[PDB]
RNA sequence: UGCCUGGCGGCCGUAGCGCGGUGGUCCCACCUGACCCCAUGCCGAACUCAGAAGUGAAACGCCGUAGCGCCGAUGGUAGUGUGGGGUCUCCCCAUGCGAGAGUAGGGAACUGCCAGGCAU
RNA sequence: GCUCAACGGAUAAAAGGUACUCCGGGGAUAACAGGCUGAUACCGCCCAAGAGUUCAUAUCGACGGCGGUGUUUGGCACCU
RNA sequence: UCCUCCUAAAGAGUAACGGAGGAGCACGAAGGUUGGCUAAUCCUGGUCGGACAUCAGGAGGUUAGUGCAAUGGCAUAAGCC
RNA sequence: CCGACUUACCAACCCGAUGCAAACUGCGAAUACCGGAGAAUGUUAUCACGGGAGACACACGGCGGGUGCUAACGUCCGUCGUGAAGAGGGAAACAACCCAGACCGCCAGCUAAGGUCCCAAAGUCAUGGUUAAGUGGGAAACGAUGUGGGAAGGCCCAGAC
């Protein structure tokens, strides 16, 4: 009984949901995977972390040549 | 409006603040009380999801 | 003594295999045992039911199996409490799959089948049916 | 094999600007000829299409695919950008390096119109 | 040559297939190929004794359907994963 | 208005692998020199520049094939409450909810802009 | 100036014995002692290739398990 | 104290005594803006050289690699000059 | 020294097959989490602030982990619920088990598990019954010609046990 050990965990996960508005600086997902990337009008930070630039209703979509999962920017 | 009868036949006691709410939207309060709401798709699907401690008279 | 060269890790969960199982249908044999319930299977009881079936067919035939004791469970020696974490590494098992064909047989009639899987009952605690492969 | 190895070469750039969503100017030189355009942010629609197939152009320059016509293909180019009223891009060398025919072509759009 | 008594399922889902259970009436489907899909509801100890025949797979069987005789094949099978029952009889027409 | 060829958007394996055949008018690259602008932790190998003697071997493009991966059938399916129960190590009753698994069944693409050869 | 290493950091600076002991509380929480459960001490009950000269069905029984005495070994944590 | 995973109810987090592996940094170049490349593995041949040092074809593409324990990321690659 | 032949042996690896999960998801979820466009509802059940609290010691009926023995009026557990805060209502007696929300009396009506031989306050009905079990009213894997049946089958007044 030696290995009982886990992180403190760091709340990652999508946290500001598409449908959700973005106010002037927010981002729209904290995580420690790009699962969701920077598509139109995000970008990215230091440490795999992505702030969104543009605000308003977020869109989801799947994108890419190896299927992957992005974070998009409606008109709102 | 349509309004189509509703009789509470037992209340939301050991039941989910889920249907706790359920009844006290519908107002349901007690035995047997009988109310009057008017009916819309979404009053009829209230009705379907606790039909079980209400009971509906046309 | 059926038992894996290597495992995964050295202990795992307790477990669950709780409603339908997937070895409904037979794959190799053409004489299997059903067992519609739940349980395990202890290594010595599969190896046992192996050595048992040789002795009756007097080794015409083969036998297969298919689920195998690669879980070491960990039960605990007597007298221990619920504490002072997990315990112990014990024993090695499979859990009983409802549908599941456990022994075969194939070279000797129906009727020295059927015996062979009561004498599979009566070396095992678990419910039993008599089963063939299936026509596609 | 060098055009996909190219593309591979060039896949990051040519993203990196369609994301970015400014429009740039494109090029794709051959050994014997060249097409130049200018497409839109996101690549949906060309502006100006002016290459050394066209005839004025193939019939004003002695060889096809080289730095002179590319230079020259950037002078034309440009100037017609200028035409339209094309004033802002942001370079796009589509996976080469900024040496040779790119290089010329590209000095000749900065003197006939584009500011890069 | 088996001609089996069958009708039409109206209303088909889990729970009619739990009470067909309780009264006794197992599903099937009928298709193959362009045709329109229909499924059947079988009679359930007469397909069992019909199919233990070893030429139920092979043969060119027909089946009565709202006063019709239809002509399919056997291509699938699903069973009760623990208990004598067909969970599915599948039909390709002939 | 159509085939071939190139510069870029719509799908991002019903596109993608494979095998049977086709193109040098325009056209890609192979290719002549690489003394040059420019490169090698050795070679103009790679890139490249002044050229078009030839080129379709590899490649690109197009048709045929459902031989693979994929799509999804319809029946069928465990499980989620919800109220009821038991045969309470786990299974069942009235519904809303509903996966997969695969299968009889489809798809090699499809689509758009601009221009070069080709002829109204 | 921090192996203040327990490191949201009681101080700049700190180990033990009590059967010679004492106070305030607790069935929060343990033990003889005092319930539910039944893996198992231990007992009852599971075929039949065979030690059993063959032989199943007699000490009997190998490779191989469930209820239980609640009677033991245990589990839980309470009624006190 | 502080780290890699399932757990914990498909956002989140969730236990000690619910299985496995660690640190008290290092690189001024193992870096960045800007120029490049893309693994691992196995068959064939060759003086050394042997299964594997190195060279020469072919088969797969992230099964290689991450500066550590490792997960999740990563081809545009943070993987390799 | 390269070696010639074969041999109820093991299996790389691919095909015809078997697989698998707490630490794998080329599959996909459900209620819903997060939300964004509506019928009615809800004595405003949301937010800000200022005065004062308890507890940091919740148990049992409906779920998945370690546990444990796939035990428990069992646990750290994540949880709806009733109780807590509610007596009363049946349970042999035992809050939660099935309820139900009493503000107080009056020898007053439509009412929820327990419910309807006796104790006993509730039915000793009409149609089907079924059964030697006293099932109900507790021990399991095991079975064995007990027995309502129901369906299918194979010999058959040219002889069936
Ligand atoms: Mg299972
Ligand atoms: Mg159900
Ligand atoms: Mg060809
Ligand atoms: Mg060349
Ligand atoms: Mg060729
Ligand atoms: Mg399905
Ligand atoms: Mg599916
Ligand atoms: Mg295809
Ligand atoms: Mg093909
Ligand atoms: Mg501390
Ligand atoms: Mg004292
Ligand atoms: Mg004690
Ligand atoms: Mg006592
Ligand atoms: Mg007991
Ligand atoms: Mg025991
Ligand atoms: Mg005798
Ligand atoms: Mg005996
Ligand atoms: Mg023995
Ligand atoms: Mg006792
Ligand atoms: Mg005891
Ligand atoms: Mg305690
Ligand atoms: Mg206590
Ligand atoms: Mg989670
Ligand atoms: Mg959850
Ligand atoms: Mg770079
Ligand atoms: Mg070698
Ligand atoms: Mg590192
Ligand atoms: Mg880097
Ligand atoms: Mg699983
Ligand atoms: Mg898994
Ligand atoms: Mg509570
Ligand atoms: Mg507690
Ligand atoms: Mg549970
Ligand atoms: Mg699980
Ligand atoms: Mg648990
Ligand atoms: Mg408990
Ligand atoms: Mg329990
Ligand atoms: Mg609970
Ligand atoms: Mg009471
Ligand atoms: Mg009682
Ligand atoms: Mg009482
Ligand atoms: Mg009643
Ligand atoms: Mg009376
Ligand atoms: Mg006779």
Redesign the pocket.
């Given at each position: 009984?030696?290995?009982?050990?886990?992180?403190?965990?760091?709340?990652?996960?999508?946290?500001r949901?598409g449908?959700?508005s973005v106010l002037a600086g927010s981002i729209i997902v904290r995580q420690?995977?790009?699962?969701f990337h920077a598509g139109a009008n995000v970008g990215?930070g230091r440490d795999?972390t992505l702030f969104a630039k543009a605000d308003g209703?977020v869109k989801f979509?799947?994108?890419?040549?190896?299927?992957?999962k992005f974070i998009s920017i409606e008109a709102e | 409006?349509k309004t189509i009868k509703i009789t509470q036949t037992?209340?939301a006691?050991?039941?989910?603040?889920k249907?706790k709410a359920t009844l006290?939207?519908?107002?349901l309060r007690?035995?047997?009380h009988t109310v009057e709401?008017?009916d819309?798709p979404?009053?009829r699907g209230?009705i379907?999801?606790?039909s079980?401690?209400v009971k509906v008279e046309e | 003594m059926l038992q894996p060269k290597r495992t995964?890790?050295?202990?795992?969960?307790?477990?669950?295999?709780?409603?339908?199982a997937?070895?409904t249908?037979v794959?190799?044999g053409s004489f299997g045992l059903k067992a519609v319930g739940?349980?395990?299977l202890?290594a010595?009881?599969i190896?046992?039911?192996r050595?048992?079936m040789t002795?009756?067919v007097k080794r015409q035939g083969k036998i297969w199996i298919?689920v195998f004791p690669?879980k070491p469970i960990?039960?605990?020696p007597?007298?221990?409490?619920?504490?002072?974490?997990?315990?112990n590494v014990e024993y090695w098992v499979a859990?009983?799959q409802?549908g599941k064909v456990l022994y075969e047989m194939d070279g000797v009639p129906e009727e020295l089948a059927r015996e062979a899987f009561?004498?599979a009952?009566?070396?095992?605690?678990?419910?039993?049916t008599f089963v063939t492969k299936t026509v596609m | 094999?060098?055009?996909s190895?190219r593309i591979?070469?060039a896949?990051?750039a040519?993203?990196?600007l369609?994301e970015l969503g400014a429009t740039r100017l494109?090029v794709?030189?051959?050994?014997?000829?060249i097409?130049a355009?200018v497409?839109?942010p996101?690549?949906?629609?060309?502006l100006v299409?002016a290459?050394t197939?066209?005839?004025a152009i193939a019939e004003q320059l002695?060889?096809?695919?080289?730095?002179?016509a590319a230079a020259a293909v950037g002078k034309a180019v440009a100037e017609r950008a200028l035409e339209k009223g094309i004033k802002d891009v942001s370079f796009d060398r589509?996976?080469?390096?900024?040496?040779?025919?790119?290089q010329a072509l590209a000095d000749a759009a900065r003197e006939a119109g584009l500011q890069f | 040559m088996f001609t089996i008594n069958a009708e039409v399922?109206k209303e088909?889902?889990?729970?009619?297939?739990?009470?067909?259970?309780?009264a006794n009436k197992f599903?099937?489907?009928i298709?193959?190929?362009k045709e329109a899909?229909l499924?059947i509801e079988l009679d359930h100890?007469?397909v069992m004794?019909m199919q233990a025949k070893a030429e139920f797979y092979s043969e060119v069987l027909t089946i009565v359907v709202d006063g019709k005789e239809i002509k399919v094949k056997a291509?699938?099978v699903?069973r009760h994963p623990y208990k004598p029952k067909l969970?599915?009889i599948?039909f390709?027409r002939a």
């Open positions: 009984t030696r290995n009982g050990r886990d992180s403190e965990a760091k709340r990652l996960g999508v946290k949901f449908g959700e420690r995977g790009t699962k990215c795999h209703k979509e799947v994108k890419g040549p190896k299927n992957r | 409006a037992r209340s006691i050991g039941r989910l603040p249907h006290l939207g519908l107002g007690r035995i047997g709401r008017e819309t979404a009053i209230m379907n999801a606790v079980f401690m | 995964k890790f050295r202990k795992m969960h307790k477990g669950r295999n709780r409603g339908l997937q070895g249908d794959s190799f739940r349980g395990r202890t010595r009881q190896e046992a039911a050595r048992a002795r009756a298919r690669d960990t039960e605990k007597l007298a221990v409490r619920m504490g002072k974490g997990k315990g859990l009983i409802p009561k004498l009952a009566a070396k095992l605690p678990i419910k039993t | 094999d060098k055009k190895a591979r070469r896949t990051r040519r993203r990196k369609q494109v794709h030189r051959t050994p014997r000829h097409y355009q497409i839109a996101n690549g949906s629609e060309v299409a290459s197939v066209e005839k002695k060889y096809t695919g080289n730095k002179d589509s996976g080469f390096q900024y040496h040779g025919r790119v | 399922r088909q889902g889990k729970g009619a297939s739990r009470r067909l259970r309780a599903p099937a489907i298709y193959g190929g899909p499924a100890d007469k004794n291509q699938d699903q969970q599915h599948d390709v």
